[PDB]
Swiss-Prot record, chain A:
Ubiquitinated; mediated by RNF41 E3 ligase and leads to proteasomal degradation, impairing inhibition of apoptosis. Deubiquitinated by USP8/UBPY. Autoubiquitinated; mediated by E1 ubiquitin activating enzyme UBA6. Proteolytically cleaved. Acts as substrate for CASP3, CASP6, CASP7, CASP9 and HTRA2. Homodimer; antiparallel. Interacts with RNF41. Interacts with DIABLO/SMAC, likely with higher affinity to SMAC dimer than SMAC monomer; this interaction blocks the substrate-binding site and inhibits the caspase inhibition activity of BIRC6. Interacts with KIF23/MKLP1, USP8/UBPY, BIRC5/survivin, MAP2K1/MEK1, RAB8A/RAB8, RAB11A/RAB11, PLK1, EXOC3/SEC6 and EXOC4/SEC8. The gene is BIRC6. Belongs to the BIRC6 family. Residues 143-147 are annotated as: HRRAR loop. Anti-apoptotic protein known as inhibitor of apoptosis (IAP) which can regulate cell death by controlling caspases and by acting as an E3 ubiquitin-protein ligase. Unlike most IAPs, does not contain a RING domain and it is not a RING-type E3 ligase. Instead acts as a dual E2/E3 enzyme that combines ubiquitin conjugating (E2) and ubiquitin ligase (E3) activities in a single polypeptide. Ubiquitination is mediated by a non-canonical E1 ubiquitin activating enzyme UBA6. Expressed in brain cancer cells. This is Dual E2 ubiquitin-conjugating enzyme/E3 ubiquitin-protein ligase BIRC6. It comes from Homo sapiens. The BIR domain is essential for its anti-apoptotic function and is important for binding to DIABLO/SMAC and caspases.
Length: 764, 519
């Protein structure tokens, strides 16, 4: 009986010296001096069954505390607590409807923080007063001297109260009532006030016994439960010693319908309990999770509440327990994969872990994934359960690409190449060719192409064997697929081996020369002016490889540079349309940005090229391209791509080597910023420390800038033009040479070394 | 230009017979969850609202839209956004219809014709099926809003729909248990919050009630030299008359009672509050609101007729449960006034309810005013409204059973007097509502006590005399001066005992001899 009383008290107490604190402490000492866990959990489980059960946060905290030991969890599993809590999940999830502000409230918000409502209402009284009390209802009448009173009432000797009925135009969620007596002379203050409310405005009913108010300068009536009221009657009782009232101002604090504890009492309290069950000890979680597995609708309700916005504070526990249950058994894992794909960022991360963790069921999971993606893409290509197949999320596809890439990189137990047949390549090719280049799903499928061809260089060789590569006419989708798939090292090596880039460079240069000749006169295949900007863009994406950048700085590519510069400056307006001119000029902008990026040999070579073309500038008006190139090329700060990895969370479609999730980060940022900035955007105290795979046990300084760092990598055997720098983040312990290296010379200073500024000033 | 083309088309094609179907089509294919096109849904949708407001003259628009609703929730024989916009839109339409009807208030918390009966029944029952299946994937605001539009359409259809054809016993049972039981209505996260319960009550009362019925005139003076001033003034006057025409065009528009099953359901509910699965206060307040709408008055006959089992369960659960707040005491008293106004279907109900002692115990609890949670036990008075309701209650009891047997009630009231003045009673210690006590005693004075048993009158007179003697002899040692006080209460009790001693003794002997005998 006593146990029932105290547990009921815990189920009816509030959150954060308090009576709840006292009961919590005495129960804690009760647990401390108890002998065995059986007689302490027995009243607890009788209370949950008898209760449904009333659970508050102190009770949750105690359940967490009493489950600290391994034996506590073992006894909980022994006497069948997990089945009962799962039943509690079913009942609680099925019972309470969501009350969070949905889209409806958002759309209703603009159709027309404690708000006063006093001026809006109308006042009256059961007796005719010589003056109306609307002066009290004003938002702020002048209260500085308070000579006699703002409003007054005169009491007949036979009467002891006066009722003041305020009718508000509409019912409001009243929060607090404040009444101001005449501060200067409060001898007239009423002895007691009895407040009556009416939600419907007619049924007028009392709230509590009249609270005494004599001798009070500030009248505050706190309402514990906020009340929807449309009419209030204020029965003010006679003052102890006066027949008159002195009142200064009435204010009506409240909320309209659309103007922590609300979530804890819901299923998430037992969800955190489940999280403790499955995560406090990683060794006993297995067989009890198996026991907690076959309960009905666990996965459905868990997924539904994960999709709910209430998980924002505690989602990590949700996906961790989901991952653990999925890994525990294969069949339920496949079933939950199906319900998460057929029936958000968290889903992406779920798929990432599901693919990445190594277990005997990993092959079955990737087989199911390949079946899912094949079905979804087939449904998309040909034009209830199939709905998830209509629009597979591109982020999930990029996640699959990242998993495949990283599985290829890591030494896997299985034979991953065995699961990638040539039929999949042909199918992926048909899928890619089935849609145009505007949307990003094509980008995703060619990222998959890049990852798999990185796994299979021979598959890339087969890919060359389709589009007449061992005249030549390639549609834009072909260029997009080749550029996306060539980013991997093996694919770029076979692209270099093939004579396709050489032939298209020669043909494009010949077309540029022909256009210059035509302008100045006013196996060969031609290129029209439409495709020149996309093919130059194709060159920009394939120029990401450092060996590609080195090849670009050779004598085999300089004729293209000279021809394009001559074409787009000297050949003023086979006629160049303005829109295509803008497209190709932006393509040259991107190409020259890519060429001079982190390649000192290319930097000095282009400095020589710019001095050569400026020395031969006509003698004197600056062309638009030269002007804009001056504004753009050597005035921008050098930007480098940083890649970050960390076992800890860190808070778009990218190349699969960059991985997925928020655990792998990738940004392209100027070198002027320091490591302190990039760490900012993301007594023994853990401290984030940057490390490099080349660097054997030295953290990186926070104020250590990136240009100096790039020079350090170039000084430590890094190929010229390597765009992405990998940095792993660790947690060091803090108790409460590198900076002195030379920075990069930059293309601007390299060009200005031999006095190009004098040339451009003369040309200005 | 959107608004302008809308106003031109509503003034031209507004009257079209295909206009409603056209509107239904374009609404279906613009806002689809599969529609990837990005457009300002809010502005164009409010514009759609405005053109529908102009088009209300056409009758087919409402029929077409509810037909779209009928075809819409067919998979519920779910896409929440479709429903949300369309129901708010029709709510706006109904609000403008209601304001037009009013100018030619239950819904005021939001604003800061003839229809085919069968299809209306179909769409409303489908709406009810949608109501009963609400999980986390749906929220409360859309629910309260669909309930409000439900109430509005129900009132709109001619004739008004009745509950017999709307719900059966299991659906009504599910509704009441979700609405009132303390397994789903525990704490501050009661269903949809207070706004939602209030709206639910609002719709219930309305459905039952329906079941039971220019430019500055300036010009350049330096141009007077030329002869072409008339050209500019005629251009100006054409232009301004055209502007007037445009504003005119824009402003102008385009020219089987469910009561037996309901009672059964309430009886089931009273049988289920015994196992403490239902909070009493919500049930009683909702019941009295549903019964009262037919301003509070003691002469208002409640529409809902109760059961003997209901009252017995009600009294025993109140007698067992202590520490009921003054709010629920006044609510209980109001509900008892209403049941006293009720007759039952031949002994009277008031006599039966008074006969058992749990009524004695509850009235004693009410008048003792212990308030064990009272940090502010300054004035235990319940307030004049509650006392006046109690006076009406006793007056109703007296005027209803005086014809049959006032004597037994007189014996009960004297029993109450004895218990309130016995050893360790409320009256001696001074707690409890003083105003209620003086009102009950003065009302008691007016009763006739002809055939009251001698034993109980002797017991009450001895008890009161002992109490008042011990009070006067052991009176206070101080008295402070600066209205009714307990001195008037003792004055009134002695006046009552004076009334008592003036009665002839039933077999002209008087009771004065009897009070003489006990020395």
């Amino acid at each position: 009986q006593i146990m029932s009383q105290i547990l009921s008290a815990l189920g009816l107490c509030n959150s954060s010296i308090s009576v709840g604190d006292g009961l919590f402490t005495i129960l804690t000492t009760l647990s401390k001096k108890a002998s065995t866990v059986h007689m302490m959990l027995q009243p607890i489980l009788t209370y949950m069954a008898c209760g449904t059960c009333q659970l508050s946060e102190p009770l949750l905290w105690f359940i967490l505390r009493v489950l600290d030991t391994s034996d506590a969890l073992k006894a909980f599993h022994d006497m069948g607590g997990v089945q009962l809590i799962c039943n509690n999940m079913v009942t609680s999830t099925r019972a309470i409807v969501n009350t969070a502000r949905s889209m409806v409230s958002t759309i209703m918000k603009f159709l027309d923080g404690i708000h006063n409502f006093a001026p809006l209402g109308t006042i009256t009284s059961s007796s005719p007063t010589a003056q109306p009390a609307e002066v009290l209802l004003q938002a702020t009448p002048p209260h500085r001297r308070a000579r006699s009173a703002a409003w007054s009432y005169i009491f007949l000797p036979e009467e002891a109260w006066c009722d003041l009925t305020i009718h508000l135009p509409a019912a409001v969620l009243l929060k607090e009532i404040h009444i101001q007596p005449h501060l200067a002379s409060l001898a007239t203050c009423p002895s007691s006030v009895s407040v009556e409310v009416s939600a419907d405005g007619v049924n007028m009913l009392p709230l509590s016994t009249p609270v005494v108010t004599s001798g009070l300068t500030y009248i505050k009536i706190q309402l514990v439960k906020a009340e929807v009221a449309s009419a209030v009657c204020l029965r003010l009782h006679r003052p102890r010693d006066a027949s008159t009232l002195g009142l200064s101002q009435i204010k009506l604090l409240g909320l309209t319908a659309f103007g922590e504890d609300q979530v804890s009492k819901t299923s998430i309290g037992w969800l955190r309990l489940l999280h403790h069950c499955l995560t406090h000890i990683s060794d006993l979680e297995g067989m009890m999770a198996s026991a907690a597995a076959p309960t009905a609708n666990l996965l459905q309700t868990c997924a539904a509440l994960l999709m709910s916005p209430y998980c924002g504070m505690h989602s990590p526990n949700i996906e961790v327990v989901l991952v653990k249950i999925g890994l525990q058994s294969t069949r339920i894992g496949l079933k939950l994969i199906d319900i998460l794909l057929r029936n958000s960022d968290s889903t992406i991360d779920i798929l990432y872990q599901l693919g990445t963790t190594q277990d005997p069921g990993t092959k079955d999971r990737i087989q199911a994934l390949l079946k899912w993606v094949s079905d979804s893409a087939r449904v998309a290509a040909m034009k209830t359960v199939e709905y998830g197949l209509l629009m597979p999320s591109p982020s999930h596809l990029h996640c699959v690409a990242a998993i495949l890439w990283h599985s290829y990189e890591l030494l896997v137990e299985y034979d991953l190449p065995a699961l990638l047949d040539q039929e999949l390549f042909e199918l992926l090719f048909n899928w890619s060719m089935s849609l145009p280049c505007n949307m990003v799903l094509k980008k995703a499928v060619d990222s998959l192409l890049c990852s798999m061809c990185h796994v299979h260089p021979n598959y890339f060789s087969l890919l060359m064997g389709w589009m007449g590569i061992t005249p030549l006419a390639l549609t834009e989708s072909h260029l997009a697929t080749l550029a996306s798939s060539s980013q991997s090292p093996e694919a770029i090596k076979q692209l270099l081996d093939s004579g396709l880039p050489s032939l298209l460079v020669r043909s494009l240069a010949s077309f540029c020369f022909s256009h210059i000749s035509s302008s100045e006169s006013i196996n060969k295949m031609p290129i029209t002016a439409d495709l020149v900007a996309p093919i130059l863009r194709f060159l920009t994406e394939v120029g990401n490889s450092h060996i590609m950048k080195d090849w670009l700085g050779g004598s085999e590519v300089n004729p293209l540079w000279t021809a394009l510069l001559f074409l787009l400056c000297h050949s003023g307006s086979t006629g160049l349309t303005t829109q295509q001119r803008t497209a190709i000029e932006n393509a040259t902008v991107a190409f020259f940005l890519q060429c001079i990026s982190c390649h000192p040999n290319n930097q000095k070579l282009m400095a020589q090229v710019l001095c050569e073309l400026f020395q031969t500038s006509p003698q004197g008006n600056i062309s638009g391209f030269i002007r804009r190139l001056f504004l753009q090329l050597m005035l921008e700060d050098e930007k480098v791509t940083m890649f970050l990895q960390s076992p800890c969370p860190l808070y778009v479609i990218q190349h699969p080597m960059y991985g997925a999730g928020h655990k792998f980060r990738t940004l392209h940022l100027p070198v002027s910023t320091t490591l302190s900035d990039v760490l900012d955007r993301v007594i023994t105290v853990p401290v984030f420390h940057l490390f490099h795979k080349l660097l054997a046990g030295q953290p990186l300084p926070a104020e250590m800038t990136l240009a100096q760092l790039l020079t350090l990598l170039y000084d430590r055997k890094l190929p010229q033009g390597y765009r992405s720098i990998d940095l792993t983040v660790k947690l060091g312990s803090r108790v409460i040479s590198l900076l002195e290296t030379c920075p990069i010379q930059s293309p601007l200073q390299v060009f200005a070394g031999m006095g190009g500024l004098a040339l451009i000033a003369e040309r200005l | 230009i959107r608004l302008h083309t809308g106003l031109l088309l509503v003034q031209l094609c507004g009257g079209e017979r295909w206009w409603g179907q056209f509107l239904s089509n374009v609404l279906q294919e613009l806002y689809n969850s599969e529609q990837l096109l990005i457009f300002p849904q809010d502005r164009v949708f409010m514009l759609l609202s405005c053109i529908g407001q102009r088009s209300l003259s056409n009758s087919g628009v409402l029929e077409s839209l509810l037909n779209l609703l009928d075809n819409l929730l067919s998979p519920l024989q779910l896409d929440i956004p479709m429903i949300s916009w369309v129901v708010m839109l029709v709510s706006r339409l109904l609000d403008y219809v209601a304001t037009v009807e009013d100018e030619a208030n239950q819904w005021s918390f939001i604003n800061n014709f003839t229809l085919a009966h069968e299809r209306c029944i179909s769409v409303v029952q489908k709406l009810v099926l949608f109501l009963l299946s609400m999980d986390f994937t749906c929220h409360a605001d859309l629910l309260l809003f669909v309930c409000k539009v439900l109430a509005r359409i129900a009132n709109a259809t001619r004739p008004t729909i009745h509950l017999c054809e709307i719900v059966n016993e299991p659906q009504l049972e599910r509704l009441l248990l979700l609405l009132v039981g303390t397994d789903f209505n525990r704490g501050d996260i009661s269903w949809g919050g207070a706004w939602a319960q209030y709206s639910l009550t609002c719709m219930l009362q309305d459905i039952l009630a329906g079941e039971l019925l220019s430019v500055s005139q300036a010009l350049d003076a330096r141009l007077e030299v030329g002869l072409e001033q008339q050209a500019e003034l005629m251009l100006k006057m054409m232009s301004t008359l055209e502007a007037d025409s445009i504003l005119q065009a824009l402003t102008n528009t385009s020219p089987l009672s469910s009561v037996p099953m309901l009672n059964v359901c309430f009886n089931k509910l009273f049988s289920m509050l015994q196992v403490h699965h239902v909070q009493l206060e919500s049930l009683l307040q909702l019941w009295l609101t549903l019964s009262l709408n037919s301003l509070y008055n003691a002469n208002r006959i409640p529409v809902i007729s109760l059961n003997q089992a209901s009252i017995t369960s009600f009294l025993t659960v109140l007698a067992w449960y202590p520490n009921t707040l003054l709010r629920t005491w006044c609510l209980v008293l109001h509900s008892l006034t209403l049941m006293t106004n009720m007759q039952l279907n031949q002994e009277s109900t008031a006599h039966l309810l008074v006969s058992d002692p749990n009524l004695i115990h509850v009235l004693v609890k009410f008048l003792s005013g212990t308030s064990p949670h009272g940090t502010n036990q300054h004035s235990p008075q319940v307030g004049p409204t509650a006392t006046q309701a109690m006076q009406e209650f006793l007056t109703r009891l007296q005027v209803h059973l005086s014809s049959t047997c006032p004597q037994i009630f007189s014996e009960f009231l004297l029993k109450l007097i004895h218990i309130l003045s016995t050893e360790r009673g409320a009256f001696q210690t001074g707690q409890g509502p003083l105003d209620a006590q003086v009102k009950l005693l003065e009302f008691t004075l007016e009763q006739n006590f002809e055939v009251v048993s001698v034993s109980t009158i002797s017991a009450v007179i001895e008890s009161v005399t002992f109490l008042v003697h011990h009070y006067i002899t052991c009176s206070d040692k101080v008295m402070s001066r600066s209205e009714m006080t307990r001195d008037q209460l003792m004055f009134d009790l002695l006046k009552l005992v004076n009334i008592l001693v003036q009665l002839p003794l039933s077999g002209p002997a008087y009771v004065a001899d009897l009070v003489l005998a006990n020395q």
